[PDB]
Design a protein around this ligand. Sequence first.
Ligand SMILES: Nc1ncnc2c1ncn2[C@@H]1O[C@H](COP(=O)(O)OP(=O)(O)OP(=O)(O)O)[C@@H](O)[C@H]1O
Ligand SMILES: Nc1ncnc2c1ncn2[C@@H]1O[C@H](COP(=O)(O)OP(=O)(O)OP(=O)(O)O)[C@@H](O)[C@H]1O
Ligand SMILES: Cc1cn([C@H]2C[C@H](O)[C@@H](COP(=O)(O)OP(=O)(O)OP(=O)(O)O)O2)c(=O)[nH]c1=O
Ligand SMILES: [Mg+2]
Ligand SMILES: [Mg+2]
Ligand SMILES: [Mn+2]
Ligand SMILES: [Mn+2]
Ligand SMILES: [Mn+2]
Ligand SMILES: [Mn+2]
Lengths: 683, 683, 289, 289
Amino acid sequence: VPKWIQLNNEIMIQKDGKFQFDKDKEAVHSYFVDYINQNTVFFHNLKEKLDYLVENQYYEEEFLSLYSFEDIKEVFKTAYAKKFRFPSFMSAFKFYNDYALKTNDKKKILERYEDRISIVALFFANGDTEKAKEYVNLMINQEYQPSTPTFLNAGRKRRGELVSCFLLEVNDSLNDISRAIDISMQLSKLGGGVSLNLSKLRAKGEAIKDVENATKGVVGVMKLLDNAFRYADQMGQRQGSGAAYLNIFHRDINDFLDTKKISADEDVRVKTLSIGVVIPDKFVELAREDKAAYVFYPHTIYKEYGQHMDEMDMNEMYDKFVDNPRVKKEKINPRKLLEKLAMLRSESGYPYIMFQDNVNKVHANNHISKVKFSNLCSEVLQASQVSSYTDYDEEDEIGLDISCNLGSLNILNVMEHKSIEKTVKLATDSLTHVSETTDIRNAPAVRRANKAMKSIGLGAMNLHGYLAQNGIAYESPEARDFANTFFMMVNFYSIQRSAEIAKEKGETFDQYEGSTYATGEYFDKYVSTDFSPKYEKIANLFEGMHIPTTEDWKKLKAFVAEHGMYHSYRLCIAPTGSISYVQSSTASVMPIMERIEERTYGNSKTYYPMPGLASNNWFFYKEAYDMDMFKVVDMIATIQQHIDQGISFTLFLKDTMTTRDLNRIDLYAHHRGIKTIYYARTK
Amino acid sequence: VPKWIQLNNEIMIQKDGKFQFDKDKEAVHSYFVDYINQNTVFFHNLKEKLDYLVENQYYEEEFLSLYSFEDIKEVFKTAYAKKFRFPSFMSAFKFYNDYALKTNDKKKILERYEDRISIVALFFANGDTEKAKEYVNLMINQEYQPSTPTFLNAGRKRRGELVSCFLLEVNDSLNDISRAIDISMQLSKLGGGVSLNLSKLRAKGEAIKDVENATKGVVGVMKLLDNAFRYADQMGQRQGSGAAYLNIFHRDINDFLDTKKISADEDVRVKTLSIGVVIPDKFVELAREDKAAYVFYPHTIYKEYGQHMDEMDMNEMYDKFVDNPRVKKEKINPRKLLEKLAMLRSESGYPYIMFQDNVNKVHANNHISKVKFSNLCSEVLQASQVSSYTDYDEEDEIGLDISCNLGSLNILNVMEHKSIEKTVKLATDSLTHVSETTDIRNAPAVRRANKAMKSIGLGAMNLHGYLAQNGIAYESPEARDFANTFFMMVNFYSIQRSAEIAKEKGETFDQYEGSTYATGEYFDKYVSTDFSPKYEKIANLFEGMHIPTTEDWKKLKAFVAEHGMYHSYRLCIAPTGSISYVQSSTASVMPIMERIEERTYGNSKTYYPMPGLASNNWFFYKEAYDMDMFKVVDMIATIQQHIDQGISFTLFLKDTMTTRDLNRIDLYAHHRGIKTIYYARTK
Amino acid sequence: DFTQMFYNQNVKQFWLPEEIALNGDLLTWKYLGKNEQDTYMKVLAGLTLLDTEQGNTGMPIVAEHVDGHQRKAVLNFMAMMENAVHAKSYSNIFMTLAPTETINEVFEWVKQNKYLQKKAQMIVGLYKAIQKDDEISLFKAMVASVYLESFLFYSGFYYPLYFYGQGKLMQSGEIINLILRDEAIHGVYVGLLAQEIYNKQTEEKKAELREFAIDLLNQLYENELEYTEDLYDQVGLSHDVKKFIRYNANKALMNLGFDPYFEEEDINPIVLNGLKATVEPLKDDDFYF
Amino acid sequence: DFTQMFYNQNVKQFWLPEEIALNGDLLTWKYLGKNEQDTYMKVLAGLTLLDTEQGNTGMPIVAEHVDGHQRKAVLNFMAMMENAVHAKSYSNIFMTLAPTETINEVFEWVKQNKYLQKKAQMIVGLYKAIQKDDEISLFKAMVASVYLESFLFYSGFYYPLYFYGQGKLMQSGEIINLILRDEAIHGVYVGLLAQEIYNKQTEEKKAELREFAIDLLNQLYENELEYTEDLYDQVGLSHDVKKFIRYNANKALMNLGFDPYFEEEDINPIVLNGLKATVEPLKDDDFYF
Ligand SMILES: Nc1ncnc2c1ncn2[C@@H]1O[C@H](COP(=O)(O)OP(=O)(O)OP(=O)(O)O)[C@@H](O)[C@H]1O
Ligand SMILES: Nc1ncnc2c1ncn2[C@@H]1O[C@H](COP(=O)(O)OP(=O)(O)OP(=O)(O)O)[C@@H](O)[C@H]1O
Ligand SMILES: Cc1cn([C@H]2C[C@H](O)[C@@H](COP(=O)(O)OP(=O)(O)OP(=O)(O)O)O2)c(=O)[nH]c1=O
Ligand SMILES: [Mg+2]
Ligand SMILES: [Mg+2]
Ligand SMILES: [Mn+2]
Ligand SMILES: [Mn+2]
Ligand SMILES: [Mn+2]
Ligand SMILES: [Mn+2]
């Protein structure tokens, strides 16, 4: 057992009835005195290091060639002047095991934290030394964290794509299904998580070229996609991850759900394909009134109306579908379906729940399309247009496939530096740069939507960490007040930066003129409701920072009207799995699952306390499972009212609560305006 | 139970110790006087029938519009003038259950045998009334039988494709793999059996752009193809059938074979994809000498030499592969691999065995490409060039994917009518028409190969029926002499018709100039060796027909040199599974499995005696399992010497014999020049 | 050729009574008439009593006389399911639906019932007649066992399946469906062991064993018809139950490798809704001809 | 007072070897000396034999003679574990670690090994000597069963535990620990049944039964010493294993309600280190907040 691992395991050993949290710090020192410095490759000067990394195909020549060597050296010096120290052993371990650049033999460390941050900053700035230094100060203060793809791969020649969330629309044809399989394989090859909408696909027992009972339904397509994702597994590094979304009014919805049951046969169950269910308000109304619902055959609806079932508003179309004899449908019990969803989420955490009307009643780009499905993490909610992939030697009709750009603000570090505006604007600029530098040659609709929509996702993390280190309970009304104010400022500065980029470049996102930004509707609740903190403690937390008022929001609305907005979407709160370790932050805006988490690496045990955990804030670091899920829903809705896309919202349940409690949480989330529900993790 | 069912079951009720074969005839009468005539749909005249079939989307109106109604009436009258009667109940039952056109609800019979034959003939003639009458006389006499796709689907609006088998070359890339999956689904949707050569795909543990041990090998692609064929299953009517072919020198050859082991795990086992193994002469030489062999990693060979492992001759490059340190290889025991092949064929009948050198030592189009794999029935052996399917928005390099149209001569009916020449020429014309009117819009390499190669497959059926009905034992040297003479005549007249078509159209198949037809090498054994019958009985059997001599072959060689050949490939002997029932013929050139076969249909059981089975020819209808497989190999080699493509050669084994006997049969087949071995069916 | 495959299927079907909550059945039980409740109780007791014989005698006696370690293990597993799982499940259903005094009375009645006793003692008689190292007596007992597993239970299973197919007594119906699924595989497995013995016999001995099986089936069938009328006439179902008995008799015969005895009939739709060659090395000179 | 709690404990301990992936032991196995691998294979083969007979014969025969449906259900479950779970798990281990020829050889070795044959002869002889309604013959067989469960397995268990405790062969070791956890409760349960019979006797009869138990233990012990030396001398551990079997002999005696017979000794510390959701329907009030 290594010395740093012993020093880390000494945390659980209680002295005077208290955990030895400070010992973790010592572990970090050991982890750097015994391992990191010994296995870190050192060079006589930075010029030699850069030459070795470029020549050995570690870095890219293009992004480094935009700067003189003096500017690169100045950026590296700015990164190293902070003298950044990892506060916990797990932060440094996760960085140097997951993100630090290693030799081809994987035994030496080529990149420190400062080196990786400097390289990512130089990639972000695209030739501006001052902008690169600003990015270096942003990331070394740990105010902003690029996502795992961006942070890991920026500036590296041997790399995947910087985007890892992809949403694909699948049209109801064999050509479109095969193209979707191909694109899923290509994007998993790039290292991205792929979500596919299967609602347009006709159900099982439908007609193919006017022969009856011929379609295999969406379950056969799910089997094909599951095989494709198993095959494309990042060159045998990570398990291929894919998601499939189906509307709850699709007839296959039960069989869809049956793919996640343990009792399902081998020809029914898909193991590497996550599933999500899109639930329109009509289904919730039918379940609430206990009226029996109807699941429709999509192809009959398409034949009758010329549009797909998921392309029209089910609230106004459901009665017409039911009363139409030419539309084929099957009787179901919506309450039974809700109970089945709750039971499946209890067993396996699936499916993801998308409340379609909750997403689309605040969607700014409904003119382009309504949000029909979400991503693999159930937080990307954007307009998508299906593509018509025709036969060979025939021109395809390329639509819009969602691929947003991830990046997370560290709420604790951002707010302690009183730099919400600067961090949000710099993160928006970096996300815009990464979106502009993304070029996928095997996903035509993804590339077209990236060029047109210019959608980015700016998330936040360390919400619970910040609240606990400031003596605020996550379920307290003060925490929701802080979340409201902080995320309203984040939205304000994100919109301001998007409008500034649109003014500078002279271009907005495609079909912006029809958006609620152009019409000013988006700013309605912002020009009438003041989002300043209602509690003195939160106001003192925001001291030293200008909180945008209704007049500031009116000025921003006028600015957007005059200049437009560059990004169709700006904010989405991703789970932030492993980057939260490196940043010493709690994951996403979720409450912490455990105060101290026990992990097993190799044959060794390691202990990670939550950041800033001590005896004084032990009570404020309440575990997520012990919390009331209604108050967690309230906080997530408070944040969601300022996020244009969704939030990865995992439910944290105890083994005692039943499926009725899960359904109640889901229905309260639907009532409170929650757009997506990610997971049902049972303790 | 139906009256005809009782009459057919009365065959096995012996009277005076003999089977009541004549009862079978009675059954057909019943089957027509109680079911077919009552379930048939009669019109006032042919005009109303044709109009009803045209407007109700049963028939394509284009092929019928090329004839005036008087000509169509004359063709139908020619078909009905023969007064064709089905001699066995099973012939009529199979036609009216599998090939006769029925209504949309399948409650009535719209097409008689004469109606189907007339429609197929009118489609074949393409506006020529005299040619349509010739086709009608050829098919109503049952001298020639179009394949099941062509016979069933010719002239139908709801038809599929007329091509039975498709062969795809899969290049070593994710884009090519995805395109192969798409094309396999498209062609299975069209109803054709798809064969894919996986020998170019790099083995398991190869590098995908400098990251090693990343590839899943051919087994992952096999699983993808298996799921694709499961999904595309002819709209749920016929199970999707696919074939995978791998060279025996591929490193994955064991894992490949492990897909068919009955103890294979679900993550490896493949159940809807047939497997074939391509064995060069080098492997047989290594096994014979007991020298340990080496299987190779295709990607290392491609990197070192710039060509795929199956793209070059292993007999001359195996030592270079072994001595090359930059080529990666694994040690295997070739005798152990042969024993594994024999055990697998005993257990499940797989893999198909393709003796590559036996195919390519007489292959006439080696300049275009060597034959690297076979079809799903292991009888199509043609040159194929792999396609380079590139990224989206990039032009693809379209290669040649094999596809040929099947058609079988009924040997008994052809020789009874003394019309080898006329039947062969008319069948060649019909297959040329089927190739010309075939246009597949989702398989580009298949379309290009169909347009360029113009390859057709003219098979033969009722070899054993003709031999047994003429008092010739199938294993006798007289039977092999008859096969030699008959198939030399078939080859002569097929080459003559191909050259005549090339002369009349002024065009040959692509790259004909480099073929052995153009250089005259193909005719060598035909201009030096006489293939006239060596037995007086066979010569009497061939009386009334001009058997080509060496002078006729020299004249044909000069004619080909002057005019060329329209078809790259002309003769391939398919299994002819279910259409042999309608023709009252034994399946293909294979010996009969059983004298009387008991088949269960619905809740009833039926007995089909072999065509012409009686007391005097009971022992001439020797069952295949009771026959010496070495003499069957001799027969198949004798036929194969006159067939440019392969023959679907099924091995018929007894349970008592061991895997060593199967290996001996395989090695004798390789020694005798057998190109492919189809199945190892054990009694 | 089959024991490891059946081992797999058996162990993967493992379940426990506690998994199904029974209390929610009281919400439909209270709405049944007296005759329906009476028939259900009597049927349930019939199944319970027969299954106890199978757990205490039928499976263990066959496991004792069958040779082969793997077969003994599968048979032990089946005996375990009878005694540890099925018996507890039947008891649980009873305790949920009836008070203690009612359970005791129903079992007293069914214990004295002529048609239940006739079949129970006929089966037990054949188990008691097995002689050491006599495969004929073992075969006869296996036939009896298959008839119990695949045939005699089904006059009883009918009623819970009938309710289950209507949305009534769903929790106990789920339990019964799991039990029935176990008995089906038990019947198929014991059937294969019986066919193994049958196939080792001469043609005359085979004909004699066939006559035994058909004669036994006839005796049991005629008693089943009486058993059926005795229980189901009061709820008007006997005609349909009789069709279900014959259909399951045919399955039992097929398990023993015999032809169906009864003509094919359709079943009540509500009940339906409820429901290696020798490896020889190459010796060289096999490559030369 | 105890059967129900043993029933619950046995069924809650249910497991299958397939739950444990064994490919993780491949390297630590490869790294052992030929002597170590030989002893390990033979040790597990000796265990397989014991479980084969405990499952085929011992547990079913005791089940037959013990009165009470619940007692029989526990004993039937234990029997199933012996041959359907325990004996089979060893084959899972063998099939992972060893080539077929080595597996074939070790099973041939059990047939010809004189100590393993002697211990099987003695234990199975006592099982087959049980006479219906004769409680003394039953007691003698239960003593034999406790000695198999709580004493005889331990010369075998030592070695997997010895490796597990050093962080070697830990997946195989996990299987063995599950088997050991089962045998411990099996030995206690059968011990309690034996004590029931013993407690019915006169003082004179009790004195004879203690003589039987101690004479049998000594006879088995002397044979186990020779078996232990035969297996462990080549790996240098015979003296250590002997201390372990004496320790467990005392536990077997205690399971029978008797005083310890061997003096306490220090055992190798390595070996000591080797040791659906509930568903409610949705109310109309759950849709409003
Ligand atoms: N907690 C830590 N986080 C990150 N790096 C660390 C940490 N502890 C030590 N290091 C690394 O080890 C070096 C030694 O740091 P130490 O605590 O011994 O003193 P120092 O005054 O920071 O040293 P130096 O002269 O290297 O700057 C640091 O410069 C840094 O590179
Ligand atoms: N074996 C058969 N094959 C094909 N069609 C048959 C067969 N048997 C009967 N039919 C059909 O059923 C009709 C019944 O007539 P059948 O053969 O009994 O003699 P028919 O009334 O004297 O006239 P004909 O033989 O001249 O048609 C036939 O005309 C024919 O259309
Ligand atoms: C992407 C991917 C490829 N492969 C295998 C199958 C293909 O035959 C083979 C080639 O993939 P390619 O698509 O050719 O990958 P590449 O072009 O980026 O890499 P290279 O330059 O070396 O050609 O890699 C996998 O096994 N799994 C995968 O996920
Ligand atoms: Mg379409
Ligand atoms: Mg490539
Ligand atoms: Mn039972
Ligand atoms: Mn049973
Ligand atoms: Mn045991
Ligand atoms: Mn035990």
